[PDB]
Amino acid sequence: SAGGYRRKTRQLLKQPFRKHGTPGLSVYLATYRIGDYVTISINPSIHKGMPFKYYHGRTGRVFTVNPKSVGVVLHKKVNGRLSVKTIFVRVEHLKKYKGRDAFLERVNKNNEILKEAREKGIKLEYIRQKEEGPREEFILNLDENKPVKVGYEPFIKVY
Amino acid sequence: EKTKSDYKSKNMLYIPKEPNFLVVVKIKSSIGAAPRQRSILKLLRLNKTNSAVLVKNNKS
Amino acid sequence: MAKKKNGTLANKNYKDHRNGIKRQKIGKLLELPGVNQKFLRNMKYAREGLK
Amino acid sequence: MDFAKRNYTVPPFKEYKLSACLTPTSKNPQPQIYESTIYAQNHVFARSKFFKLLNDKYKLKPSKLVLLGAEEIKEQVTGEVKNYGISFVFRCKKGLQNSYREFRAISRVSALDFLFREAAIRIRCKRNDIFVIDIKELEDEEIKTGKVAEFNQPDLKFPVFGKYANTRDLYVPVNTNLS
Amino acid sequence: ARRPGRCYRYLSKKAYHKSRFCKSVPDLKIKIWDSGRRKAEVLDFPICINLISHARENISEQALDAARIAAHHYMVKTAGRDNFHLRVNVYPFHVLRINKMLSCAGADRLQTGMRQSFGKPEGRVARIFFDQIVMSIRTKKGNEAAAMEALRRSRHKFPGKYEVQVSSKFGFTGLYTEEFNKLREEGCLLANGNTVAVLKQKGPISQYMKKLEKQL
RNA sequence: AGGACACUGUUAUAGUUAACUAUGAGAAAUCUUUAAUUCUAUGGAAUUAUAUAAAUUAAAUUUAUAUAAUGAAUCUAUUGUAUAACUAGUGGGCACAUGAUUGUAAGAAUGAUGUGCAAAAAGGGAUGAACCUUAUGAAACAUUAAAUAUUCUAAAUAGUAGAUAUUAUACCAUAAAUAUGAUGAAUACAUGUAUUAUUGUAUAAAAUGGAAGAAGAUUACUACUUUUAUGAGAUGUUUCUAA
Ligand SMILES: [Mg+2]
Ligand SMILES: [Mg+2]
Ligand SMILES: [Mg+2]
Ligand SMILES: [Mg+2]
Ligand SMILES: [Mg+2]
Ligand SMILES: [Mg+2]
Ligand SMILES: [Mg+2]
Ligand SMILES: [Mg+2]
């Protein structure tokens, strides 16, 4: 626990139970382009291209693609401000960030509603995410629903 | 009352809707407070004691 | 010394949020240091024949 | 409250009949309804006591519940004194206990408050710590305590020891009789 | 000499065991944990009496020895050497420490005061939480009155507050008496030496018939 | 944290033909497992048509760059936001609440999160740097908070009941193992024997004449409710001064 490159890693760089071994082919078949969104997860079975332990699990953006490295931009919290960092990692340490898929589907579907309303004279009725407000009203039936009486009950010791 | 009585004859309950707004009153002074409860009191415009506002009720 | 106090970390968080916390804006992409040199030379040649 | 110094005929605690159910969803629309009677001071205090009881017998969180309707029950009092027997569970320092008492009052709202006066000495606990199971009117030949059986016998006469002054003044002359 | 017992009475948050990090530990004094006639089977002694605790404390290893001799010497005098089975539950794992300020100091390799103040081991204790059983006897239907007296004498050796009472289980198995009698009516009980074993319908069928001749 | 004895380290005894089956005890440097919390990211740009290359492919085939057009999409708050230049003081800190390490222990030593005193007024804790109400120019009138209502001392000796001991303080200015009494209290059994709850006394020893703040109090002590009144640069109404 002195100040080194790999300090205090006992449960962060341990491979989980019944999952040892070299990774598979579905990692290597993926591609990355400039402007995507990528999270970082260390696979502790290769020793060429590991980043520092601080960046384990933070999402960034991809700006360059090299023959052996990918470039990711991030944000670190140095004493006062929020700065800008760049790192080069290998392909076996990344993962495609989901979470824009429900957003990018909403872009493609709203773009279709705008197109069909050009042929008509109506105003646009876009798709936006729902809101939750006060509790709405409902209707209960007392034909098949019977109330159950609830009351207190005397205390009984466990033995 | 008329929609409640017409559902009464068919043994229906008809619980109505909630109110649309609330009334918020500040009572205790806020000199020594935690940083989060200081931030929420700023967003409700409640810097002065014995003051009231109006707020829409949502899930948030 | 008098074996004084070594050092604490109290009100480090209070001194930070006095003037807020500024977020340094990443500029336009393909301008940060470290772009592939082979990729940049072809980008330069493609712009000259354009204009 | 003309002769007395506190309201002993209408105590602060009242009787409320409550009912509630769960908010409807997609997996389960139209759920089960429940009903009970809790004794409290307003319907808001009685809402909080009843929703905690529904947390223990069933796994129903109070954040998902909805209050249906709560009304108050009053009794047309005639004025004859009756006998009552209350069974309840109280919380103390060491744990929970359950007991039984017998009283004598005009109505069951009033007979509850005679329990709080006795519990202030024998038990020494706050009034929110007693949970009342049931109040019933007792007929004859079920009285298990000699105190109720001594006062139930007819034609009682006993005098009173006089110890109270009849003037609210600072000083009176000597030989004026405070009868 | 040994320190008073008020110096080591309340629990620390973390335990400190004997392992490769702490080697030089002295030996124990208590050696016998089960006394009486321990060879008797399930059907000999059907009534069990416990001692349940009421405090969060440290019970020293030397105190557990003297409490066992007190309860054993009384039951011999009244019930006999073959009418009870006595046992202790806990085992001392925790280790204590002493700073041990000396006289000759102020020189090389003998410093004073709070300089270099990690302790050296002295003895062992057991760690006891709320609502825990410490000791137990099983007897017959006759000696129920004697063991409430013999467990009373052992209580005054411990610090704190303790309570003796009659349990509702059948001997040293983990079975209530109501649950014991329904199983013996069906015949889903197996006769192991000290206690019983429950027979179920989980294995293959041919092994179920193999288990059945050790019924009772 | 909780959980478990299945891996690593540890421990008491009985059985069946070294192996299996039971009832017990465990872990700052053990894990088949695993919450409350803490933190990171998205919630507007995307598509079409045309062109450029000395990159890239078996290939108009991809990866990139232009120009044209097509837009305001989660709740609340903020009228500004952003950028430069010059320069002082400080680097011995302490306390409260929550949770820890060493130590037999300390108004002891050393870390973690929040708020204070330092540098902060008035009112209350008899008196006190840090406890409880509480934001700030000069005054007058009404309403409360914290705390109190026999008298000193402004304000009802305004109610039900118990305590016999010179009883009665949130931080706060000490009391234990143990032995026995009493209730028109409760449950089991035969007017009494067992437990449970509440409560009294003994255990209880110091240096000038003494401290519930004091006189004194048994209805000025203790336990539980509802009304009335007194009481702060607090909060309302009016007059006046400061860019
Ligand atoms: Mg190498
Ligand atoms: Mg100074
Ligand atoms: Mg002051
Ligand atoms: Mg004082
Ligand atoms: Mg006066
Ligand atoms: Mg007034
Ligand atoms: Mg003011
Ligand atoms: Mg004022």
CSV table of C-alpha atoms in Angstrom, one decimal, chain D residues 103-172:
chain,number,residue,atom,x,y,z
D,103,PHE,CA,-64.7,-0.2,34.6
D,104,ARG,CA,-68.0,1.7,35.1
D,105,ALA,CA,-69.0,4.7,32.9
D,106,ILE,CA,-71.7,6.2,30.8
D,107,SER,CA,-70.3,5.4,27.3
D,108,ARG,CA,-67.4,3.6,25.8
D,109,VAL,CA,-65.7,6.8,24.8
D,110,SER,CA,-65.8,7.9,28.5
D,111,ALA,CA,-64.8,4.4,29.8
D,112,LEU,CA,-61.6,4.5,27.7
D,113,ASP,CA,-60.5,7.7,29.5
D,114,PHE,CA,-60.9,6.1,32.9
D,115,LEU,CA,-58.3,3.6,31.7
D,116,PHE,CA,-55.8,6.3,30.9
D,117,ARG,CA,-56.2,7.8,34.3
D,118,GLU,CA,-55.5,4.5,36.0
D,119,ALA,CA,-52.6,3.7,33.6
D,120,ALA,CA,-50.9,7.0,34.6
D,121,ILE,CA,-50.0,5.6,38.0
D,122,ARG,CA,-49.8,1.8,37.8
D,123,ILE,CA,-48.1,1.6,34.4
D,124,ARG,CA,-46.5,5.1,33.8
D,125,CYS,CA,-46.5,5.3,30.0
D,126,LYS,CA,-47.5,7.7,27.2
D,127,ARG,CA,-51.1,7.4,25.9
D,128,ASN,CA,-50.0,6.3,22.4
D,129,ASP,CA,-48.4,3.1,23.8
D,130,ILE,CA,-51.6,1.3,24.7
D,131,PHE,CA,-53.3,-0.6,21.9
D,132,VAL,CA,-57.0,-1.3,22.7
D,133,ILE,CA,-58.4,-4.6,21.4
D,134,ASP,CA,-62.1,-4.4,22.2
D,135,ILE,CA,-64.6,-2.6,24.4
D,136,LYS,CA,-67.8,-4.5,25.3
D,137,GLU,CA,-70.7,-3.9,27.5
D,138,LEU,CA,-70.9,-6.5,30.3
D,139,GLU,CA,-74.1,-7.9,31.6
D,140,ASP,CA,-74.5,-9.3,35.1
D,141,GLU,CA,-72.8,-12.5,36.4
D,142,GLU,CA,-69.7,-11.8,34.2
D,143,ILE,CA,-68.2,-9.3,36.7
D,144,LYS,CA,-64.9,-10.7,37.8
D,145,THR,CA,-63.8,-7.9,40.1
D,146,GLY,CA,-65.3,-7.1,43.6
D,147,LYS,CA,-65.0,-3.3,43.0
D,148,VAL,CA,-67.6,-3.3,40.3
D,149,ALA,CA,-69.7,-5.8,42.3
D,150,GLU,CA,-69.7,-3.6,45.3
D,151,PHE,CA,-71.1,-0.6,43.6
D,152,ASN,CA,-73.7,-2.5,41.5
D,153,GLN,CA,-75.8,-3.3,44.5
D,154,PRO,CA,-78.9,-1.0,44.8
D,155,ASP,CA,-79.7,1.7,47.3
D,156,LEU,CA,-76.2,3.1,48.1
D,157,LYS,CA,-75.8,5.8,50.7
D,158,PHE,CA,-72.5,7.2,52.0
D,159,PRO,CA,-71.6,10.7,53.3
D,160,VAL,CA,-68.8,13.0,52.3
D,161,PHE,CA,-65.9,14.5,54.3
D,162,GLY,CA,-66.0,18.2,53.8
D,163,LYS,CA,-62.7,19.9,53.1
D,164,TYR,CA,-63.3,22.7,50.5
D,165,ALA,CA,-63.6,26.4,51.1
D,166,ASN,CA,-66.6,28.3,49.7
D,167,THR,CA,-65.1,31.7,49.2
D,168,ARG,CA,-62.5,32.9,46.6
D,169,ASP,CA,-61.2,35.8,48.7
D,170,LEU,CA,-57.9,36.6,50.3
D,171,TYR,CA,-58.9,37.0,53.9
D,172,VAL,CA,-62.1,36.5,55.9
